[PDB]
Amino acid sequence: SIKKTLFVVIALSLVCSIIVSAAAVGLRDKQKENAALDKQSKILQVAGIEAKGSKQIVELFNKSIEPRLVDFNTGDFVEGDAANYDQRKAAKEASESIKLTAEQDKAKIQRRANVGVVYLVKDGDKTSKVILPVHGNGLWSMMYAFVAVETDGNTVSGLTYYEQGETPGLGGEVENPAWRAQWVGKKLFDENHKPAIKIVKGGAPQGSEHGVDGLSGATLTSNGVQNTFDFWLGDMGFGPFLTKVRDG
Amino acid sequence: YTPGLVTKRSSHVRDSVDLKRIMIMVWLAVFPAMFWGMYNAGGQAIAALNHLYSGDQLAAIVAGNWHYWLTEMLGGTMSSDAGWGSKMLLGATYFLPIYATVFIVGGFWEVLFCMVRKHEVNEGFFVTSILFALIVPPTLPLWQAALGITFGVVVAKEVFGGTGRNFLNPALAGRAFLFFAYPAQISGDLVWTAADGYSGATALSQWAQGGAGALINNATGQTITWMDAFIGNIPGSIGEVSTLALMIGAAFIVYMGIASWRIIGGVMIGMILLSTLFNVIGSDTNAMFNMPWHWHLVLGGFAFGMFFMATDPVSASFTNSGKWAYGILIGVMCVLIRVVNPAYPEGMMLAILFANLFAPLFDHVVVERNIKRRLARYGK
Amino acid sequence: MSTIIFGVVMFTLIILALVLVILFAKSKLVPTGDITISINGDPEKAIVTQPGGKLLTALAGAGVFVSSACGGGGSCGQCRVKIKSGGGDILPTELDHISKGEAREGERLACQVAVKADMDLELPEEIFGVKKWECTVISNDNKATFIKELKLAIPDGESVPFRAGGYIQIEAPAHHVKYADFDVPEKYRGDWDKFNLFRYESKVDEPIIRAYSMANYPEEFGIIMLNVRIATPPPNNPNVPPGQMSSYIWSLKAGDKCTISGPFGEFFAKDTDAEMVFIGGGAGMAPMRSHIFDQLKRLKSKRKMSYWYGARSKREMFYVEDFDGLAAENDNFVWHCALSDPQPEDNWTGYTGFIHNVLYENYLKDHEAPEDCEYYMCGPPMMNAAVINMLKNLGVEEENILLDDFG
Amino acid sequence: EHYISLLVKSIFIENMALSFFLGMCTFLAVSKKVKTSFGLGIAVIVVLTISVPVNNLVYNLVLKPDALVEGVDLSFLNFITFIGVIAALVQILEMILDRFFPPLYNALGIFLPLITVNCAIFGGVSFMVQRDYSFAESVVYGFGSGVGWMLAIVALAGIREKMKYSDVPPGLRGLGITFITAGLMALGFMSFSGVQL
Amino acid sequence: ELKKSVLAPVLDNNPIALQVLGVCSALAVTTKLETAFVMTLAVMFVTALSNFFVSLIRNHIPNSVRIIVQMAIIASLVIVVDQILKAYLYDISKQLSVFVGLIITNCIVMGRAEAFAMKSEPIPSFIDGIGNGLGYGFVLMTVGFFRELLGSGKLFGLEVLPLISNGGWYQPNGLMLLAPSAFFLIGFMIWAIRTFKPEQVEAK
Amino acid sequence: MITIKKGLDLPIAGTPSQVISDGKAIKKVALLGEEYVGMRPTMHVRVGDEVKKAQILFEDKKNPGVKFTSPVSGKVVEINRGAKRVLQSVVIEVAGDDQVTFDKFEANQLASLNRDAIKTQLVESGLWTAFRTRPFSKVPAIDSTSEAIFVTAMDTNPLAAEPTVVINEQSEAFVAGLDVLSALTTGKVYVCKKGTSLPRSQQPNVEEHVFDGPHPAGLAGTHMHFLYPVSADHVAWSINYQDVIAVGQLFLTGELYTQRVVSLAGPVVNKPRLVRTVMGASLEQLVDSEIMPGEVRIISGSVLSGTKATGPHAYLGRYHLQVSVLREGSMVPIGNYEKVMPLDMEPTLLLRDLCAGDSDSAVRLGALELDEEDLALCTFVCPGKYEYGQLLRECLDKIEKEG
Numbered sequence A: 001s002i003k004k005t006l007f008v009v010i011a012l013s014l015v016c017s018i019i020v021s022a023a024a025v026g027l028r029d030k031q032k033e034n035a036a037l038d039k040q041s042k043i044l045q046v047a048g049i050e051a052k053g054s055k056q057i058v059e060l061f062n063k064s065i066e067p068r069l070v071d072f073n074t075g076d077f078v079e080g081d082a083a084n085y086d087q088r089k090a091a092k093e094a095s096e097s098i099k100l101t102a103e104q105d106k107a108k109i110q111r112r113a114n115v116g117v118v119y120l121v122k123d124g125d126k127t128s129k130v131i132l133p134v135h136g137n138g139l140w141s142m143m144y145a146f147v148a149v150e151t152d153g154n155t156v157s158g159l160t161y162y163e164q165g166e167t168p169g170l171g172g173e174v175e176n177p178a179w180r181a182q183w184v185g186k187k188l189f190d191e192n193h194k195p196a197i198k199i200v201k202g203g204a205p206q207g208s209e210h211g212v213d214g215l216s217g218a219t220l221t222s223n224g225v226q227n228t229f230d231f232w233l234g235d236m237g238f239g240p241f242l243t244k245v246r247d248g
Numbered sequence B: 001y002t003p004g005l006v007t008k009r010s011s012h013v014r015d016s017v018d019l020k021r022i023m024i025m026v027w028l029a030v031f032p033a034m035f036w037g038m039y040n041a042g043g044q045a046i047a048a049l050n051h052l053y054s055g056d057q058l059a060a061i062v063a064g065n066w067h068y069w070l071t072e073m074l075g076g077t078m079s080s081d082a083g084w085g086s087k088m089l090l091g092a093t094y095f096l097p098i099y100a101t102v103f104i105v106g107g108f109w110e111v112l113f114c115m116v117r118k119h120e121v122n123e124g125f126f127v128t129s130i131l132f133a134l135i136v137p138p139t140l141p142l143w144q145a146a147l148g149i150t151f152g153v154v155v156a157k158e159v160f161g162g163t164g165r166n167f168l169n170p171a172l173a174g175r176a177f178l179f180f181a182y183p184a185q186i187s188g189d190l191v192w193t194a195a196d197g198y199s200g201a202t203a204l205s206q207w208a209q210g211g212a213g214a215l216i217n218n219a220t221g222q223t224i225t226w227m228d229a230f231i232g233n234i235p236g237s238i239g240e241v242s243t244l245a246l247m248i249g250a251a252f253i254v255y256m257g258i259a260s261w262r263i264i265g266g267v268m269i270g271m272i273l274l275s276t277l278f279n280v281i282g283s284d285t286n287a288m289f290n291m292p293w294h295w296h297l298v299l300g301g302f303a304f305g306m307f308f309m310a311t312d313p314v315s316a317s318f319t320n321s322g323k324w325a326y327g328i329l330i331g332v333m334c335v336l337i338r339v340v341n342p343a344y345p346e347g348m349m350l351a352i353l354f355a356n357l358f359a360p361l362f363d364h365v366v367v368e369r370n371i372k373r374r375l376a377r378y379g380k
Numbered sequence C: 001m002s003t004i005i006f007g008v009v010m011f012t013l014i015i016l017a018l019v020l021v022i023l024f025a026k027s028k029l030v031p032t033g034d035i036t037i038s039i040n041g042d043p044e045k046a047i048v049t050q051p052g053g054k055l056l057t058a059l060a061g062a063g064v065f066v067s068s069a070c071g072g073g074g075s076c077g078q079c080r081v082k083i084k085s086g087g088g089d090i091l092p093t094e095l096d097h098i099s100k101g102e103a104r105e106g107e108r109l110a111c112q113v114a115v116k117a118d119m120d121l122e123l124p125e126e127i128f129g130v131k132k133w134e135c136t137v138i139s140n141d142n143k144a145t146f147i148k149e150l151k152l153a154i155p156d157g158e159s160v161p162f163r164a165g166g167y168i169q170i171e172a173p174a175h176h177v178k179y180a181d182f183d184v185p186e187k188y189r190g191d192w193d194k195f196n197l198f199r200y201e202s203k204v205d206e207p208i209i210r211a212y213s214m215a216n217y218p219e220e221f222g223i224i225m226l227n228v229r230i231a232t233p234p235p236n237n238p239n240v241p242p243g244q245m246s247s248y249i250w251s252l253k254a255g256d257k258c259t260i261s262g263p264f265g266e267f268f269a270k271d272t273d274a275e276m277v278f279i280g281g282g283a284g285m286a287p288m289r290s291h292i293f294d295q296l297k298r299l300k301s302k303r304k305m306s307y308w309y310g311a312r313s314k315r316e317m318f319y320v321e322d323f324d325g326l327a328a329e330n331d332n333f334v335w336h337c338a339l340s341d342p343q344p345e346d347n348w349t350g351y352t353g354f355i356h357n358v359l360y361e362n363y364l365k366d367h368e369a370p371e372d373c374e375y376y377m378c379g380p381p382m383m384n385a386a387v388i389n390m391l392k393n394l395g396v397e398e399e400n401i402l403l404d405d406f407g
Numbered sequence D: 001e002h003y004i005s006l007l008v009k010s011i012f013i014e015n016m017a018l019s020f021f022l023g024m025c026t027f028l029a030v031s032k033k034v035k036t037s038f039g040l041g042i043a044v045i046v047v048l049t050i051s052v053p054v055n056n057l058v059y060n061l062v063l064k065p066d067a068l069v070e071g072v073d074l075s076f077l078n079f080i081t082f083i084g085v086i087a088a089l090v091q092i093l094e095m096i097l098d099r100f101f102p103p104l105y106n107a108l109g110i111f112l113p114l115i116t117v118n119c120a121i122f123g124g125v126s127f128m129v130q131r132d133y134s135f136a137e138s139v140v141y142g143f144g145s146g147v148g149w150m151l152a153i154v155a156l157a158g159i160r161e162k163m164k165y166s167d168v169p170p171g172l173r174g175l176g177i178t179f180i181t182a183g184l185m186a187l188g189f190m191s192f193s194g195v196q197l
Numbered sequence E: 001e002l003k004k005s006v007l008a009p010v011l012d013n014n015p016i017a018l019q020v021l022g023v024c025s026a027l028a029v030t031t032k033l034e035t036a037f038v039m040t041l042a043v044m045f046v047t048a049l050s051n052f053f054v055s056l057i058r059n060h061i062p063n064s065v066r067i068i069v070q071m072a073i074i075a076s077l078v079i080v081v082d083q084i085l086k087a088y089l090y091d092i093s094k095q096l097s098v099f100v101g102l103i104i105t106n107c108i109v110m111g112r113a114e115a116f117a118m119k120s121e122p123i124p125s126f127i128d129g130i131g132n133g134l135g136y137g138f139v140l141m142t143v144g145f146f147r148e149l150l151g152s153g154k155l156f157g158l159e160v161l162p163l164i165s166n167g168g169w170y171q172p173n174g175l176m177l178l179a180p181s182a183f184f185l186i187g188f189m190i191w192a193i194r195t196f197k198p199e200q201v202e203a204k
Numbered sequence F: 001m002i003t004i005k006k007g008l009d010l011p012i013a014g015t016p017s018q019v020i021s022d023g024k025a026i027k028k029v030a031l032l033g034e035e036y037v038g039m040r041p042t043m044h045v046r047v048g049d050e051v052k053k054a055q056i057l058f059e060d061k062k063n064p065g066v067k068f069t070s071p072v073s074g075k076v077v078e079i080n081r082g083a084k085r086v087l088q089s090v091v092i093e094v095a096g097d098d099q100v101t102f103d104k105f106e107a108n109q110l111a112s113l114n115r116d117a118i119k120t121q122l123v124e125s126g127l128w129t130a131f132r133t134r135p136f137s138k139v140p141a142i143d144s145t146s147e148a149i150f151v152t153a154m155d156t157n158p159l160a161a162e163p164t165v166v167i168n169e170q171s172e173a174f175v176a177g178l179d180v181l182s183a184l185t186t187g188k189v190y191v192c193k194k195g196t197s198l199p200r201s202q203q204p205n206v207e208e209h210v211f212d213g214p215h216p217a218g219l220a221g222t223h224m225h226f227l228y229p230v231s232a233d234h235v236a237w238s239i240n241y242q243d244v245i246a247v248g249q250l251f252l253t254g255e256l257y258t259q260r261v262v263s264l265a266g267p268v269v270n271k272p273r274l275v276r277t278v279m280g281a282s283l284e285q286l287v288d289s290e291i292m293p294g295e296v297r298i299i300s301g302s303v304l305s306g307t308k309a310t311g312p313h314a315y316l317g318r319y320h321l322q323v324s325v326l327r328e329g330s331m332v333p334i335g336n337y338e339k340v341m342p343l344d345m346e347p348t349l350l351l352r353d354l355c356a357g358d359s360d361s362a363v364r365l366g367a368l369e370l371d372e373e374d375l376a377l378c379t380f381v382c383p384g385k386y387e388y389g390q391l392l393r394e395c396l397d398k399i400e401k402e403g
């Protein structure tokens, strides 16, 4: 009967939506805090700084990580609240972001912020390494990673994907310690200052300077990682900054 | 004690042809490609070795590889002044172990299935064994050849009931297994020449990087001309290099009626059309766009597949109209993979395999259309 | 709870829009009301039934009854019906019991067919003309060790209309019956006391319906003779429940009542001059008796008639006096019987063994035209399967042999 | 234009069955007969071509962050909203088969309802939200994905019909060999692996 | 009561071997035993709870809108388990990853919801979810064992076969990492299951 | 007119001279039961019975009313039966000159005769068995009718006799037979011949159609496919030219005409030529004193399609007009089958259906248009050495039975 069907669907819809809406909105706040603490944990992990517990991570992160702002169009340090900078929100607004062309959008990211935060790791009063956030569209979700670049501006010290929504086992292997550890020692550029990090389907030759094995059965997610690095290491990303990092 | 007419009305005469005779014809058809392959395999290896080493350094290399000093023991010479006998002898030391391993390992699976399931052994395995051994890199490890034939014989043929009862090309299915399971041994610059410590890209890889002008034999320093690729004096799979040798064998089986000329014609039509289309469109960045049809013919395994594997009767379409479509799809797919797929320098194995999947559908479209004419009594 | 409220209402709106489309689609795509099914094209026989349920259920409620043995399982195939229209194509299970040529006609299994839209039916006279009567038991005496003769009497005074070789469906409710309740003569009791079949007790959980062939030629009026074989667990599976319907019949005696639910059957002879051959076995003596009686006085046929009954012992033999009279009175009919295992006291001096080979070694072996003979068979599957194989080895076409195996 | 390329991606390069391995449960089940396989493929196109663009509008108009009101993002109502929408079309579809249901309703049985809950259908909506496709691109993508799915299912049905002459061991007959056949089909569809966009 | 219902869907009515459900997830997570094991637990928990709830409302489900009711129960539970996990046990929440979508479309969750929940009482319906998920995991983990061992030399991330990359004699097999290997492995599991249980063999 | 290109003419040594001579005297004759499709005999004779020329020997249980009459007058010397008592042959020893006569009519009346009258005379005389239905190549039911009757006035079988030479001797009987077929057919009569000239019927119903080309061109199935495609609901009748002469003789003289002209040919035939014999003639006696020494095989019919004339089957078949003598010496399609099939069919797929037993699919692909002989060339060229004539009858029997 029409009367029974509308009653059950409405009643079932209301109870389930209320539970879902309450759970999502209510636990969102706790989730928001937990996720933020994670990024400080990731920057430390890639930096090689062992931290454990929210206070150790927050305390060690503030002291040891020197967030700074960089203008991509010039690759030079700028002044702002780097510690409280949300590059993601900026990339969504035309005021502090640009729209990429089909040709330019190698990483498949719709927009790129005019200014992006970088993190400097300081063993003492100097920079022992610089950590650059790079993101690019995956098969299922955007994949955000941290790349620890040594003071040389060429050698990569560490890699970690702090945001991914690819399928675990296939595309979620950006989190696999073995795959991330494979990046240590690789070179981001060639002699001609052109991106040379390449994700090799089927496995890079052992000892390759710029060869990281792709994610098995996950070409689309591996393509995103390549697309991530092909853009952010390029002209419109951190390319100019790394040349400057390279000279100083 | 008196059978009925059923058993007695059998056609009292039969054609001399039988399945056993068909297979030997295909088996003999590849002998010219096989023999040249061994000769080419030894020649390529000897040239690279002299280009990489000399003096006592060459002697140490020859002494540390059973392929080299076994050739010396039997009367050959690893020096560059070696004649055809030593080159063919050295190439045999690579082909024969691969062919022996493939024959023995694959034959074991053939007999095992027939024995357990009470089937009589079938002679189709003669073609599968020889073709698989002639489409692998010369340096392929034997243990990988054993696995490749095992996958091809078992997964592609036996589990479907054996010869005449499968849908996918067994030999190419085995090669795909090695291609995707152990790509390092069947893809790259270290497997297509048997000179240890030698790195050399084959012609197709070279054209995709730079252009036809980049077509160089690193060992000799001499340019690779179209004539070179046609005769097969180029690096590659033992058996694919010589377009001339394959044509000679292909002519016989085509003449004997064992290999379909509609499939072969379709492959050429698809290849010429698409490659010419790429030529006209052009690409300032992708060098594969400018490869003409006549270069596509003498490069890679296009010739071997068109002549000896696309013509696999069981895996192809069973209708004359479908055979054209089946061949055209192979030729189109091969050029497409060759040109617009960066990962693969050649795409014939994948191309034939793709076409195998769709040959039954092409027949269905054709056969259902015949039924529409029949249900209309052919308009009579 | 600002966002929680907004999501809850927006969710409901999305759901309401989706269901409203579905509900709207249901109204404009799914039939409403009641389903009307036409039976034989006669408006009176047309049945108006609400949607849902199988066809075998709706038809039974109306005045037309469809024969069914397996029921709602689609196994026997005796409930085949002609669907002129509706119902779609034949389900794959139905094809197991219906040939493609039959499918062209429109034959379908009512039970396997689900009634969901208007359908057309052409049920025949026999299926339409089913009458339920409750006869009175006169005699339930045991003819043999495991065979009982039942004399059911119609209370309406009018005899039963049926063809030779027909059958009547017997329906009984749930009931617990013990084998000890059966009354058996001393002759057959002695065989029964060795294995003590009286120990078995049957408990029919749900009402059951079965079929029983007739043992009275039509001219016999007022009485439904039936021959019943007691159902006991299988020789290979003693760990089986005992008989439920046959056991219930055996429990009855003089004065008892049972339902016949009208007649049915498709076992009959051919109105020709070809020689007739009868092969009876066990409970098969019921339909065979009707054929011989039908062909002697109902038809007064002068055609050659032969009967070959398979029995295990002289005790097992019954109806011998009637067969002897028919053979003696009319020479056109001759009956014979062979004992598969004569008792020591029987001292049988006639045919011994199975009619499978006895009939061949005596009559069909020297027969000039075994194919030119109508064959009718009813008995244990072993006897039927073996006999038909022997008949087939003699070049007897299936159209010349009619099988009515009772299991 | 750009659209033809999108259609090519969603049919061949991104073949949902043989490339992405989505919808294998219905794909490996109704694969025996070309006519039945073709009917399901047609229905899948119908469901896909309607499901994706409708969910695209709902996502961009309701579930899109900061879309209905500024500061409220109903992203968490993404999976429940989409599956519910997909389920509705399936619910309408079941009745619609009743007009063409004899050929497929009996054969599909349990899987007609299971079209909702097909990895292929849910995934297509996800890509339409994980990516940013206009309404015109959503229709082209949805139709293309369905057609590519139909090509694979219809192809597997052609192969299986051809296997009437095959001699399959018992135990592999039916599902077991079908899985092997599908694995072999995926092998040949890997020809497009390097193809990009 | 007995364990027969729990173990029936393991080898007698395996959801992937005899029935055809959940194959899509089998080909993605059977690359690792770790991912496979988590997927089995997720499917077991969700199938059992969802089957349980549908039984409570079985008599009230309209066939017209049954699918909506069935999916809503499944989707709500999966979303909540994801939200609950994100707020508490956030580290594991990342682990559930995209498995929120991959369990909703798992055909086992809806398949058992219609065949069993709709025609059974909730308590036995719950037992159906635990049992079906078990058989799903029997196939998932058996395939995961071969794919991880032969494709990576590792089981649960622990190196059983030394890899050449680590100076180990074993060269990993690249096909075991891709989808086709799972197709072939599952087919051979069906062969073993149906040759040891001929009752399940398909007729001719 | 209609030209055939796809086919095969087997170039076997020992072609006949195409001159009609007298064969060895025949004192033994038989009718072969197994030749008639779906024929279950009801015997009307016993061993030792004396029979007349056109006396009934047996009847068909599954084709009621069809009478199989003797070819000669004499004695029944044996009734050979095989497995399950299948009637192989009913041998009659020639003796005497007795015959059963029938009504005779003028030539100008035959075209006007009532259809039922023609059927009765043909059925009673036993000449009704000359007709075969195409969709099953069975003797037509007595009560059935056909809108298209095909006359095979050509013979492209290897070593076959020339119909023109035989028809030339019996021009009046052949024309009279065509007139009778004109009245018998509901539609038209198709006289399928080669380019050569033949006597013509004055009826507008009788149309002459020329077929040229290799072997398959001379088969009634080929002619039906091009002129009157057959299906379950479009049934054609087939009759060869010598039976047409017999039909004309029956309705002109009132007597069953049983003489036949058959080519005795083959590599081991010393003087291959055309010989006069009788229906069902004993082939052992027919080839006596005409074969080279050695172990030879006598074949009723052509080498492509025919019965091994050994033992109970060593008699001329009903539909066979030639005797060929020879010395005793998995569906992998390489394109051989298509080359010998001129019909609008996909032969490899059809043969696969027969191998697989897919009866319904084979029906869809045109099995119903086929007789076993239409698949003889496909059998000949088969690398797997399948015998498709047998597979087709198994499929056709299945269709008849289930249908």
Ligand SMILES: Cc1cc2nc3c(=O)[nH]c(=O)nc-3n(C[C@H](O)[C@H](O)[C@H](O)COP(=O)(O)OP(=O)(O)OC[C@H]3O[C@@H](n4cnc5c(N)ncnc54)[C@H](O)[C@@H]3O)c2cc1C
Residues within 6 Å of the ligand: C069, C167, C208, C210, C211, C212, C213, C226, C227, C228, C229, C230, C231, C232, C233, C234, C240, C241, C242, C243, C244, C245, C246, C247, C283, C286, C406, C407
């Ligand atoms: C046209 C026709 C005519 C027939 N005529 C006769 C006739 O004249 N006489 C006659 O006796 N029968 C006749 N039958 C057979 C009749 O239908 C019954 O099979 C018979 O009466 C026994 O009934 P039952 O239910 O007790 O047998 P069943 O119980 O169905 O027989 C099964 C066998 O196993 C035992 N068993 C009981 N319950 C079970 C169970 N649940 N599972 C397994 N085994 C079980 C029984 O003891 C028996 O041995 C006829 C059938 C047909 C179709």
Ligand SMILES: CCCCCCCCCCCCO[C@@H]1O[C@H](CO)[C@@H](O[C@H]2O[C@H](CO)[C@@H](O)[C@H](O)[C@H]2O)[C@H](O)[C@H]1O
Residues within 6 Å of the ligand: B272, B276, B279, B280, B290, B291, B292, B293, B294
């Ligand atoms: C019926 C049997 C026939 C046997 C074989 C048939 C082959 C027939 C030739 C097919 C057409 C050849 O096609 C023509 O080939 C020549 C090379 O020869 C190409 O010549 C060149 O031109 C283009 C210019 O755009 C260059 O980029 C490139 O080097 C090459 O393509 C032409 O671009 C192409 O148009």
Ligand SMILES: CCCCCCCCCCCCO[C@@H]1O[C@H](CO)[C@@H](O[C@H]2O[C@H](CO)[C@@H](O)[C@H](O)[C@H]2O)[C@H](O)[C@H]1O
Residues within 6 Å of the ligand: B358, B361, B362, B364, B365, B366, B368, B369, D034, D035, D038, D151, D154
């Ligand atoms: C990658 C490129 C190669 C693959 C693409 C090219 C092949 C395309 C195949 C489409 C699928 C096959 O399509 C097939 O077409 C035929 C007519 O030809 C349809 O025709 C048949 O089915 C219809 C269904 O309504 C019925 O009327 C009848 O049984 C018949 O006409 C088949 O039902 C269908 O199965």
Ligand SMILES: CCCCCCCCCCCCO[C@@H]1O[C@H](CO)[C@@H](O[C@H]2O[C@H](CO)[C@@H](O)[C@H](O)[C@H]2O)[C@H](O)[C@H]1O
Residues within 6 Å of the ligand: B141, B143, B147, B151, B155, E150, E169, E170, E171, E172, E173, E184, E185
């Ligand atoms: C159904 C799907 C397909 C089924 C087939 C898949 C089977 C997968 C498991 C294959 C394992 C083979 O494992 C392989 O054994 C061989 C045997 O020497 C080892 O081989 C090793 O020693 C040999 C000895 O000559 C050297 O030549 C070789 O270079 C070296 O690798 C490999 O290092 C090892 O990796």
Ligand SMILES: Cc1cc2nc3c(=O)[nH]c(=O)nc-3n(C[C@H](O)[C@H](O)[C@H](O)CO)c2cc1C
Residues within 6 Å of the ligand: B022, B023, B026, B124, B125, B127, B128, B129, B131, B162, B163, B164, B165, B166, B168, B169, B170, B171, B172, B253, B258, B259, B260, B308, B309, B310, B311, B312, B313, B314, B315, F332
């Ligand atoms: C003309 C011809 C070509 C063949 N080509 C192949 C082939 O390429 N690969 C193969 O494994 N077998 C080949 N065979 C052998 C056999 O036909 C084939 O394996 C079938 O797929 C199944 O036996 C060929 C046979 C013939 C007659």
Ligand code: FES
Residues within 6 Å of the ligand: C068, C069, C070, C071, C072, C073, C074, C075, C076, C077, C078, C079, C080, C109, C110, C111, C112
């Ligand atoms: S009741 Fe037995 S099949 Fe219908």
Ligand code: FES
Residues within 6 Å of the ligand: D022, D023, D024, D025, D026, D117, D118, D119, D120, E021, E022, E023, E024, E025, E105, E106, E107, E108
């Ligand atoms: S379609 Fe069944 S799990 Fe994906």
Ligand code: NA
Residues within 6 Å of the ligand: B337, B338, B339, B340, B341, B342, B343, B344, B345, B346
């Ligand atoms: Na390429």
